[PDB]
Design a protein. Structure first.
Lengths: 21, 673
């Protein structure tokens, strides 16, 4: 449950601040 | 003596070490210090189970788990779960003793040590208010805040209503003026002044009164950015001087009350709202009982005068010449000076620790730069190559981690790569070589790679005092494109989306368009790129202005050939999504017309969610208050029960698995729902 394939890994087309916990 | 009234001392007091030592140990009323100590202890007691993570310790530190951890030092390791519960219990007891004033010094140390151990345990939980809590505890350890309104005076008639030295207030006042000054001198960055950091914060309903005389963009530019910068820069000067104390008090109170509602930053707002009466006279609690009714003036302790103490040096014109200060007074003065100097210097120490400097300087947590830089992540890809057979595989991004902050820092990335290298052999993999490919856009800029994708991070070189070599520089000479980017984004339909990408020369981007992503195209804005279709092997060159349509369900590669960085954009439509919505709307309209003369289930559940939202809007605030109190009570009860279970296990021993299961199931009962 920790391996992908080339198809799902290469999908590119699918803001946060570090102070809020 | 106008300056003597303005500053509280004279120039002659700073002309010698002896005079300064005498001035810094001047007797002072201890009431304000006691009130601040009580409030700080109470707030820390309330904060320990919520933000520090006492109610998630079993999930975070579950025994026998494969997790990658990010400590400041790899020599620091966590203990088993029961010893974590013991450490948190000790910290809670220390905070309670600090609040009550009972055994002040021992309680201070008991709170101080485990807190900093837990703080240094994980680098991914550092922020500014946790750092402030640690600093405040460290300061309060060396003070004497149990000289008034404390249990320690009831069982000892030598620390009740006694004087305190002056530097006890000077240290705290100097600290609260570094927070506000070094926080508005970091908000003189072009992205805060121009109004790019917090652009959507003005949409809140709490800014509605300002909209009666200002436009939305003007409200965002003036009230949120410039007003905040001016308040941060001038709050300390307003609070210090008694001519303008009331206006400064009102302004900072309004500011912190607003910030408590806008964001979720724990107890930061309440802490800094109780640290502002430490700028008023040290006798304000004593004077505040003169306005309460005399009926309620008899249950409180009698307001006598402070009694002499050995901590502060005494210099009187008639009451003897004065005693030579001992080691205590000189140590206190030296501590004040050195601590203030170091606190001033530390936020600007980033030119020494060059290994922690990414796009943003230093590690986050100790530089007083809040809500200045915002990040957006587009794609993350982790690929390993087997060192024996050469097979290529892809890992799920963020597998053995409990955070997401490793994507921005090179040290955290190195730690994650080492953890993966150690953990992968357990899954039938030889020694791996791991590569990373992360696209980040900071403050509404072009998306670009932050790390080199051709470098094996396992064997890379990283040092704390050396600048990292595999970190891609931020393309600063593309910010003036943001107005055109915003215009292009605004000039769109309700179905299309746009992605802006800037690529370095010599690298290429490989993408796989999904089947549902029909009608996708690439348009070039600057530079020159070549697009290759993997299926039909052929290259096509592009120039500034033209666009090309790409197929669905196929691999395509984009190559950058210009000597300078080039930027393009993606325009794509979800054909399946639009078709689904249009048929759903048509069917709903037809059914409504017929009645009045799984897609349906999705529409009905969305309508049910909207109805629930509108009913929660219509209902008053008392149900929300009841629910909030119920949730808080549940979290407190859960933490208490798990702590008791672990303490019993530590003291006696593991009784049995069945009984353990029964008590664990009991501990999550959700009292009232
Ligand atoms: C020391 C406790 C400080 C508590 C921190 C609270 C806030 C202060 C902010 C500190 C910023 C960063 C500190 C930089 C120096 C300390 C770290 C250090 O030396 O060790 C790091 C590094 C390895 O770290 P890993 O966790 O493997 O790196 C992650 C990727 N693998 O260690 C080494 O290289 C071995 C030791 C070499 C340096 C040792 C120290 C030499 C002198 C520097 C003084 C250290 C600073 C102390 C700060 C005091 C005042 C703030
Ligand atoms: C107009 C000329 C000065 C311009 C600006 C003046 C100060 C600006 C705003 C300062 C806000 C608070 C930051 C500093 C807080 C610590 C000093 C402090 O609280 O002073 C008050 C206090 C007396 O005040 P009260 O009796 O409450 O009188 C009420 C005032 N109406 O005075 C003292 O603390 C005496 C100590 C002298 C300064 C020592 C503390 C700071 C030391 C600085 C360390 C850095 C080293 C370099 C400095 C060189 C100093 C030799
Ligand atoms: C004495 C033995 C028994 C003790 C208790 C008996 C049963 C009562 C059990 C209490 C369980 C729940 C109460 C504790 C919750 C306290 C409020 C709290 O922490 O609120 C959190 C909230 C932040 O929440 P977020 O999730 O960020 O909200 C998002 C908003 N944008 O923070 C605050 O509200 C801070 C306010 C500080 C506390 C308010 C003080 C007012 C009440 C004072 C208490 C007076 C008595 C205290 C104890 C008396 C002992 C003699
Ligand atoms: C028996 C089972 C069902 C446990 C359920 C009880 C809980 C509702 C208890 C367990 C821990 C208790 C808390 C433990 C510690 C404190 C600290 C205490 O802080 C103080 O100010 C008290 C000290 C003092 O003023 O003398 C206030 C009550 C509170 C929140 C208690 C409120 C009630 C809690 C959450
Ligand atoms: C600075 C800002 C956000 C960042 C940050 O505030 C945060 C989150 C914070 O935790 C903090 C703690 C202590 C010191 C500084 C900071 C901050 O940096 C947003 C300003 C907006 C503000 C909430 C309204 C300001 C309005 C003007 C002051 C106008 C006066 C009011 C009118 C009645 C005349
Ligand atoms: C593919 O998507 C593009 C982008 O939305 C469509 O181009 C738009 O076409 C409409 C005409 O119906 C124009 O009004 C818009 O101005 C066009 N957009 C842009 C950015 O020029 C295109 O029609 C779509 N093609 C198909 C077959 O659906
Ligand atoms: C498409 O053009 C590129 C030149 O940009 C050709 O050469 C490749 O260039 C990239 C980027 O420099 C290298 O990483 C590759 O190794 C080059 N060779 C190949 C085979 O990709 C590329 O050959 C052209 N494509 C075709 C099908 O001719
Ligand atoms: C049992 C052990 C792990 C507890 C940890 C204790 C040591 C490491 C803690 C206790 C007090 C801490 C110090 C408290 C205050 C400051 C000032 C700050 O500006 C830099 C960090 C610094 C200097 C801390 C460094 C870490 C420190 C020295
Ligand atoms: C939108 O496109 C994605 C692929 O990028 C697809 O998984 C998703 O199902 C689409 N939306 C709908 C509503 O089908």
């Amino acid at each position: 449950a920790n391996f992908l394939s080339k198809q799902q890994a290469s999908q590119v087309l699918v803001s946060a601040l570090e102070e809020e916990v | 003596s106008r300056i003597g009234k303005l500053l509280g001392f004279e120039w002659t007091d700073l002309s010698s070490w002896r005079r300064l030592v005498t001035l810094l140990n001047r007797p002072t009323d201890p009431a304000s210090l006691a009130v601040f100590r009580f409030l700080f202890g109470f707030l820390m007691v309330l904060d320990i189970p919520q933000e520090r993570g006492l109610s998630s310790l079993d999930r975070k530190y579950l025994d026998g788990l494969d997790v990658c951890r990010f400590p400041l030092l790899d020599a620091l390791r966590p203990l088993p779960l029961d010893w974590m519960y013991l450490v948190y219990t000790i910290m809670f007891l220390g905070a309670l003793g600090m609040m009550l004033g009972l055994c002040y010094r021992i309680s201070c140390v008991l709170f101080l040590l485990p807190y900093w151990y837990v703080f240094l345990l994980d680098k991914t939980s550092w922020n500014n208010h946790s750092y402030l809590y640690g600093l405040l505890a460290f300061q309060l350890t060396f003070m004497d805040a149990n000289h008034y309104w404390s249990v320690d005076g009831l069982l000892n008639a030598h620390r009740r209503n006694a004087h305190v030295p002056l530097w006890n207030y000077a240290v705290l006042r100097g600290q609260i003026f570094i927070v506000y000054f070094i926080a508005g001198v970091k908000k003189l960055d072009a992205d805060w002044v121009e109004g790019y950091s917090m652009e959507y914060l003005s949409r809140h309903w709490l800014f509605s009164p300002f909209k009666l005389l200002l436009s939305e963009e003007l409200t965002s530019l003036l009230v949120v950015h410039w007003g905040g910068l001016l308040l941060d820069l001038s709050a300390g000067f307003l609070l210090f001087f008694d001519v303008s104390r009331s206006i400064g008090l009102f302004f900072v109170s309004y500011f912190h009350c607003m910030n408590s509602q806008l964001f979720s930053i724990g107890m930061f707002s309440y802490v800094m709202l109780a640290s502002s009466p430490l700028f008023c006279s040290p006798e304000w609690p004593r004077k505040l009982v003169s306005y309460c009714p005399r009926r309620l003036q008899q249950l409180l302790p009698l307001k006598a005068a402070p009694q002499p103490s050995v901590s502060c040096v005494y210099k009187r014109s008639r009451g003897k010449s004065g005693q030579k200060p001992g080691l205590r007074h000189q140590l206190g003065a030296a501590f004040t000076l050195l601590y203030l100097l170091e606190q001033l210097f530390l936020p600007y120490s980033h030119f020494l620790t060059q290994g922690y400097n990414n796009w943003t300087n230093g590690l986050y947590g100790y530089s007083w730069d809040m809500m200045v830089h915002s990040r957006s992540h587009q794609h993350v890809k982790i690929t390993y190559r087997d060192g024996r057979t050469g097979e290529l595989g892809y890992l799920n991004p963020g597998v053995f981690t409990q955070s997401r902050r490793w994507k921005d820092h090179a040290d955290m990335l190195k730690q994650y790569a080492t953890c993966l290298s150690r953990l992968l052999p357990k899954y039938n993999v030889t020694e791996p070589q791991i590569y990373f490919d992360i696209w980040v856009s900071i403050n509404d800029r072009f998306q670009q790679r932050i790390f080199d994708p051709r470098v094996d991070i396992v064997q890379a070189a990283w040092s704390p005092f050396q600048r990292t070599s595999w970190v891609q520089p931020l393309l600063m000479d593309l910010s003036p494109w943001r107005a055109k980017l915003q215009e292009i984004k605004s000039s769109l339909d309700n179905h299309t989306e746009v992605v802006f990408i800037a690529d370095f020369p010599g690298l290429h981007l490989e993408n796989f368009v999904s089947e549902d992503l029909g009608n996708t195209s690439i348009q070039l804005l600057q530079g020159e790129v070549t697009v290759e279709l993997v299926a039909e092997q052929k290259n096509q060159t592009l120039r500034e202005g033209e666009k090309m349509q790409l197929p669905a369900g196929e691999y395509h590669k984009v190559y950058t050939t210009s000597p300078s960085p080039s930027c393009y954009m993606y325009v794509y439509v979800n054909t399946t999504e639009l078709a689904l919505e249009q048929d759903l709307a048509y069917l709903q309209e037809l059914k409504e017309k017929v009645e009045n003369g799984p897609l349906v289930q999705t529409f009905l559940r969305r309508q049910q969610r909207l109805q629930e939202i509108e009913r929660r809007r219509n209902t008053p605030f008392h149900e929300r208050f009841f629910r909030f109190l119920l949730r808080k009570l549940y979290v407190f009860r859960r933490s208490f029960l798990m702590t008791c279970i672990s303490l019993r296990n530590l003291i006696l021993g593991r009784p049995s698995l069945e009984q353990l299961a029964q008590e664990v199931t009991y501990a999550n009962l959700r009292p009232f729902e």
